Amino acid sequence: MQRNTYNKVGLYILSLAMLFVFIIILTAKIIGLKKLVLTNIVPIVCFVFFLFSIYFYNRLKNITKYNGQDSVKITSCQSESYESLTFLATYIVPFMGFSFEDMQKNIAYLLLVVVIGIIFIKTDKYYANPTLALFGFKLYRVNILHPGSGETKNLIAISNDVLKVDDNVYYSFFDEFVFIARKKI
Amino acid sequence: MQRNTYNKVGLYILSLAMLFVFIIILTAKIPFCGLKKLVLTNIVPIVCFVFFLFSIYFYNRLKNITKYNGQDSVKITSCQSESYESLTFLATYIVPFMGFSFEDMQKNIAYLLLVVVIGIIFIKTDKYYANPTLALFGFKLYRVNILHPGSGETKNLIAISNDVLKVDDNVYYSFFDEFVFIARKKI
Amino acid sequence: MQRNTYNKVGLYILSLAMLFVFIIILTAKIGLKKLVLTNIVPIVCFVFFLFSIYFYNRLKNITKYNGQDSVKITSCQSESYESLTFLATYIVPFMGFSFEDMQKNIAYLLLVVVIGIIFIKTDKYYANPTLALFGFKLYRVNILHPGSGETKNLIAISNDVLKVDDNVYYSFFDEFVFIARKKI
Amino acid sequence: MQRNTYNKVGLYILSLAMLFVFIIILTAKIGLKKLVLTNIVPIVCFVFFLFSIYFYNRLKNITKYNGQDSVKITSCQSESYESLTFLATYIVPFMGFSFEDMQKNIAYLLLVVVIGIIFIKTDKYYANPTLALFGFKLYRVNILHPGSGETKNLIAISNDVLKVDDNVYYSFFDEFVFIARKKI
């Protein structure tokens, strides 16, 4: 339960990484180093989320590095390629002027991004935010066959590589709704 | 007739409950320390606080709707996972420049007329069940064909429930309006 | 062509009429010629609202026309999409940005006219559920005109619910759509 | 490969052609180089306004390339979507954004590019209605080349109107999506 949820939010934090770079180039109050961290209190507290996202980006590729225990079977392929652009129109646009010169206001903006965190995970739509396509992630439904268990029903999968039809390659499961794939050497 | 519109707009207030919590946390005024001037600055926070208590009351009302069992027939078959959940309705309701902006009072009631016009024009188009804030409270949305104990089979109507429900399970229900309805699980 | 485009763009005018009656309250800043001179955009959007009143009564007078018009409909089916990207690009801008300078207000009126010509050319006028606030419902219906023949499921607009296979009244917009009434 | 992408980005950069027309109006500041130094955001987008004209004559050269190409299309069908999620995100919200300060004005120009890097890779550059403002009506076509086989529901771009099942002319963006026009 816990380990299915900590990796779950990691794509969403990776999905907000393209948002996070704007705040540095939107908040530029630029020697009294105590005053600079006082005046520019907002970029120095959001830069760690850039460090969080890169850490999850290295984490996401490290799941694919585990190759000593993975199973290898895929039946068929289908590239649906939705990547719904409406999510960009929900989460990145409404922070026009993210730092409107009052920290009490800026609590609510940071309150907004975490409340939609529970919203946009529990609705199970995190894999269609088009910021994930910036990192070359291709989306597709494939009904695989497991080597041990039976046939799956056209499950949504996200991966960085283009798959041909019925290619028995490596992968790694995320849950029984989505997973992460690989290629066979 | 009046109760259908009443619990329709009550579900709309439950959808806007997070907007309400955001706007108490947004436009509350700092004392940092004669109270009547602070109350005069507290007018938008207190009216949306009354709105938030209305949301609490209608959430308790929905729990009461789950609680009446004496007049409840069961008679449920099948299940189909529709799961539409269009987030554009979130992007229009809960972020009107994030609710309100703190400059002018007549502009504030202009946004008040904006949100009540939005309320009437999305209750008149029979698609109130749209926001992904109902799923924040734990609800899930999917469309199931139902037979009646007295009447026959429905025609692919929308259902709403909190607890998890599956195919051909004979479970409880409520009656929101003549079209959509709330379900539970049979104990 | 001129009358067809005129009563085509009038639906979009009535769509934006709700935005105009918001912006009356939005930009109202209250020997009165100074008050006239400062609040010129309430006056011109009030004029636009009067144009909306004129077109609402114009299509109402169109709906009274049933004698000289042909009145033949068969069948019915309902689609009823009326999505909200239209209102997301219509109302949400005018509450999104700031509205002070008249020089930039000229550019916002140029927004209005170019988004009108976009929504005219691409055939997305029959949209923005502000129309459905005025009793309107959307569904495509294959109608029969026995002088001409059977049509193929063209999208239709009416202010009343119409069921299947009823020889109700209509009035004709242009080569694809029409407004509809109910027979007596 | 190399020549495909530079023509692929031209559809997006001409879809923002009218966006440049209001930036010179929204930030209209009206020896004399100090006047130029104030209004850098009109005069920079006036250059891509000239680039929008430049690609508009360039795409006509693509249609008017030569005569040995552009052989035949067998079938035709229509989709005509012009989905409006791309509007209110691409043309509109920059006016929803405000231009008053220098450091944001560079920062919103990075918001232009990071849209387009996504928008190219999502393969959605046949959907802006601003491209349809220039007279283009957009519709998928199954084609059969004489020397090649039958392709499966590829996307066609055409200014002038075409009917169904006619052997007509074309031109290429790349192998997948293509320009269509009419046979003399």
Q: DSSP labels for A161-179?
A: S---TT----EEE--SS-E
Task: Give the integer Cα–Cα distance in Å for B3 and D127.
Answer: 44
Q: Is A9 helix (H, G, I), strand (E, B) or coil?
A: helix
Q: SS3 sequence, B15-47? A: HCHHHHHHHHHHHCCCCCCCHHHHHHCCHHHHH
* C166 within domain boundaries: yes
Phi/psi at A139 (nearest 5 deg)?
-120, 145
Phi/psi at D10 (nearest 5 deg)?
-70, -25
Of A90, A108, A109, the CB nearest to B91: A90
Can you name the residues that pair with B160 across neighbouring β-strands? B141, B182
Single-letter residue type at B74: V
Q: How do beta strands C178-180 and C154-158 pair?
A: parallel
Q: Is D45 helix (H, G, I), strand (E, B) or coil?
A: helix
Task: Give the integer Cα–Cα distance in Å for C91 and C22.
Answer: 10
> Which pair of tokens denotes residue C96?
């999104």
Task: Give the integer Cα–Cα distance in Å for B131 and B89.
Answer: 6
Phi/psi at B142 (nearest 5 deg)?
-165, 155
Task: Give the integer Cα–Cα distance in Å for B130 and B146.
Answer: 22
Neighbours of D22 (CB within 10 A): 22
Residue with tokens 């130029």: D36
Task: Give the integer Cα–Cα distance in Å for D104 and D99.
Answer: 8
Computed from CA positions of residues D87, D92, D96, D102, in that sequence, does the dihedral angle turn out positive or negative? Answer: positive
- Minimal Cα distance from B103: which residue of C? C98
Contacts by D103-108 with C-beta closer than 8 Å and gap 24+?
D103/A25, D103/A26, D103/A28, D104/A26, D105/D41, D106/A25, D107/A22, D107/A25, D107/A26
Residue with tokens 């959808």: B15
B179 vs C: CB within 8 A: no
**Per-residue DSSP letter, C180:** E
Neighbours of C158 (CB within 10 A): 22
Can you say whether residue D80 is alpha, beta or left, with left for phi > 0 and alpha for psi between -120 and 50 degrees? Answer: left
> Which pair of tokens denotes residue D11?
């559809």
**Per-residue DSSP letter, A16:** T
> Which pair of tokens denotes residue A151?
């046939």
Q: How far apart are the first and last CA of chain C?
A: 32
Can you say whether residue B156 is alpha, beta or left, with left for phi > 0 and alpha for psi between -120 and 50 degrees? Answer: left
Look at residues C123, C167, C127, C125 and name the one whose alpha carbon lies nearest to residue C143: C167
Task: Give the integer Cα–Cα distance in Å for B39 and B55.
Answer: 22
Look at residues B184, B136, B175, B132 and name the one whose alpha carbon lies nearest to residue B157: B175
Of A18, A28, A133, the CB nearest to D121: A133
Residue A71 near residue A147 (C-beta atoms within 8 A): yes
Rounded (to 5) percent helix, strand, coil in chain C? 50, 10, 40
Residue A13 near residue A89 (C-beta atoms within 8 A): no
Computed from CA positions of residues B166, B170, B175, B179, in that sequence, does the dihedral angle turn out positive or negative? Answer: positive
Look at residues A122, A121, A132, A111 and name the one whose alpha carbon lies nearest to residue A19: A132
B84 vs A: CB within 8 A: no
Whether D84 and C124 lie within 8 Å, measured CB to CB:
yes
Residue A133 CA to its chain's centroid (Å): 10
Experimentally, the structure was elucidated by cryo-EM
Q: How many CA atoms lie within 13 A of C75 on its CB side?
A: 15
Task: Give the integer Cα–Cα distance in Å for B25 and B33.
Answer: 19
Non-local CB neighbours of C57 within 8 Å, separated by 6+ positions: none
* C55 within domain boundaries: no
Residue D120 near residue A134 (C-beta atoms within 8 A): no
Residue A91 near residue A129 (C-beta atoms within 8 A): yes
Whether B117 and C18 lie within 8 Å, measured CB to CB:
yes
**Per-residue DSSP letter, D85:** T
Look at residues C25, C3, C4, C13 and name the one whose alpha carbon lies nearest to residue C131: C13
Task: Give the integer Cα–Cα distance in Å for C90 and C131.
Answer: 13
The residue segments making up the domain with residue C177 are 69-82+129-184
Task: Give the integer Cα–Cα distance in Å for D91 and D16.
Answer: 7
> Which pair of tokens denotes residue C113?
């006219």
Instruction: Tell whether B107 and B164 lie within a shared domain.
Output: no
Q: State which H helix or E strand residue A21 sits in.
A: helix A17-26
Q: Is D117 helix (H, G, I), strand (E, B) or coil?
A: helix
C110 vs D: CB within 8 A: yes
Residue with tokens 């909200």: C84
C130 vs B: CB within 8 A: yes
Instruction: Give the strand order in the sheet containing C178-180.
Output: C137-141, C154-158, C178-180, C170-172
Whether C93 and D96 lie within 8 Å, measured CB to CB:
yes
Task: Give the integer Cα–Cα distance in Å for A12 and A131.
Answer: 10
Task: Tell me the chain D residues in contact with residue A88 when contact means C-beta distances shorter than 8 Å.
Answer: 89, 118
Task: Give the integer Cα–Cα distance in Å for B4 and D52.
Answer: 54
Residue C71 near residue C167 (C-beta atoms within 8 A): yes
Phi/psi at A78 (nearest 5 deg)?
-160, 115
Single-letter residue type at D23: I
**Total residues belonging to chain B:** 187
Q: Is C78 helix (H, G, I), strand (E, B) or coil?
A: coil
Task: Give the integer Cα–Cα distance in Å for D56 and D10.
Answer: 9
Per residue in D100-123, is it b (16+ CB within 10 Å) or e — as a string?
A: eeeebeebbeebeebbbebbbbbe
Non-local CB neighbours of A3 within 8 Å, separated by 6+ positions: none
Residue A96 CA to its chain's centroid (Å): 22
Residue with tokens 């067998």: D74
Suggest the residue from C86, C99, C104 to mutate for an interface test with chain D (most D CBs closer than 10 A).
C104
Task: Tell me the chain A residues in contact with residue D88 when contact means C-beta distances shorter than 8 Å.
Answer: 89
Single-letter residue type at B42: N
B105 vs C: CB within 8 A: no
Residue with tokens 């068969």: C74
Of C85, C95, C130, the CB nearest to B96: C95
Residue with tokens 């439950």: B14
Q: State which H helix or E strand residue C93 sits in.
A: helix C85-96
Instruction: Tell whether B93 and B108 lie within a shared domain.
Output: yes
Q: Measured between alpha carbons, how far is residue B50 from residues A105, B11, B53, D53 in Å?
A: 21, 16, 5, 57
How many domains, chain D?
Answer: 1
Task: Tell me the chain A residues in contact with residue B97 when contact means C-beta distances shorter than 8 Å.
Answer: 94
Task: Give the integer Cα–Cα distance in Å for C140 and C152.
Answer: 9
Q: How far apart are the first and last CA of chain D?
A: 31
**Per-residue DSSP letter, D122:** T
Helix orientation angle between C40-64 and C102-121, rounded to the nearest 10 degrees = 20
Q: SS3 sequence, A72-119? A: CCCCCCCCCCCCCHHHHHHHCCCCCCCCCCCHHHHHHHHHHHHHHHHH
Task: Give the integer Cα–Cα distance in Å for A35 and C9.
Answer: 57
Instruction: Tell whether B95 and B187 lie within a shared domain.
Output: no
Closest CA–CA distance from residue C25 to any residue of chain B (Å): 6
> Which pair of tokens denotes residue D116?
């387009």
User: Exposed (0-12), middle (13-18) or buried (19+): which is A128, by Cβ within 10 Å?
Assistant: middle
User: Exposed (0-12), middle (13-18) or buried (19+): which is D134, by Cβ within 10 Å?
Assistant: middle
Can you name the residues that pair with B118 across neighbouring β-strands? none
Q: State which H helix or E strand residue D138 sits in.
A: strand D137-141
Single-letter residue type at B157: L
Task: Give the integer Cα–Cα distance in Å for D183 and B125.
Answer: 47
The two most distant CA atoms of chain D are separated, in Å, by 65
D110 vs A: CB within 8 A: yes
Task: Give the integer Cα–Cα distance in Å for D48 and D61.
Answer: 19
Of A87, A89, A94, the CB nearest to B98: A94
Q: Is C128 helix (H, G, I), strand (E, B) or coil?
A: coil
> Which pair of tokens denotes residue C132?
């459905």
Q: Measured between alpha carbons, how far is residue A3 from residues A7, A122, D138 in Å?
A: 7, 16, 47
Phi/psi at B25 (nearest 5 deg)?
-70, -25
Phi/psi at A172 (nearest 5 deg)?
-155, 125
Closest CA–CA distance from residue A39 to any residue of chain B (Å): 20
Task: Give the integer Cα–Cα distance in Å for C117 and C9.
Answer: 9
D22 vs C: CB within 8 A: yes
Instruction: Tell whether B40 and B78 lie within a shared domain.
Output: no
Q: Is C170 helix (H, G, I), strand (E, B) or coil?
A: strand
Single-letter residue type at A97: G
Q: State which H helix or E strand residue B158 sits in.
A: strand B158-161
Can you name the residues that pair with C137 across neighbouring β-strands? C158
Single-letter residue type at A180: I
Residue C150 near residue C72 (C-beta atoms within 8 A): no
Computed from CA positions of residues B13, B15, B21, B22, in that sequence, does the dihedral angle turn out positive or negative? Answer: negative
- Alpha-helical regions (H) of C27-167: 33-38, 40-64, 85-96, 102-121, 130-133
Task: Give the integer Cα–Cα distance in Å for C82 and D172.
Answer: 35
Task: Tell me the chain B residues in contact with residue A94 when contact means C-beta distances shorter than 8 Å.
Answer: 91, 95, 97-98
Single-letter residue type at A6: Y
* C112 within domain boundaries: no
Of C83, C95, C132, the CB nearest to B114: C95
Single-letter residue type at A32: G
Of C25, C82, C92, the CB nearest to B106: C25
Residue A158 near residue A180 (C-beta atoms within 8 A): yes
User: Exposed (0-12), middle (13-18) or buried (19+): which is A165, by Cβ within 10 Å?
Assistant: exposed
* Dihedral angle over CA of C139, C140, C145, C151, nearest 10: 180
Task: Give the integer Cα–Cα distance in Å for A172 and A183.
Answer: 11
Which chains neighbour B (Cβ–Cβ under 8 Å, 3 or more pairs)?
Answer: A, C
Task: Give the integer Cα–Cα distance in Å for C25 and C23.
Answer: 5
Of D28, D85, D98, the CB nearest to C85: D85
- Minimal Cα distance from B116: which residue of C? C22
User: Exposed (0-12), middle (13-18) or buried (19+): which is A41, by Cβ within 10 Å?
Assistant: middle
Instruction: Tell whether B126 and B181 lie within a shared domain.
Output: no
Residue B67 near residue B182 (C-beta atoms within 8 A): no
Residue with tokens 């199973």: A71
Q: For chain C, what is the total number of helices (H) and then of strands (E)?
A: 6, 6
Task: Tell me the chain A residues in contact with residue D122 when contact means C-beta distances shorter than 8 Å.
Answer: 81, 83, 85, 130, 133
* Reported resolution, Å: 4.3
Strands (E), C9-143: 137-141
D99 vs C: CB within 8 A: no
Residue C73 near residue C141 (C-beta atoms within 8 A): yes
Which chains neighbour D (Cβ–Cβ under 8 Å, 3 or more pairs)?
Answer: A, C
Task: Give the integer Cα–Cα distance in Å for B98 and B22.
Answer: 9
Closest CA–CA distance from residue A118 to any residue of chain B (Å): 7
> Which pair of tokens denotes residue D102?
């220098």
* Dihedral angle over CA of C70, C73, C78, C82, nearest 10: 0
Neighbours of D157 (CB within 10 A): 22
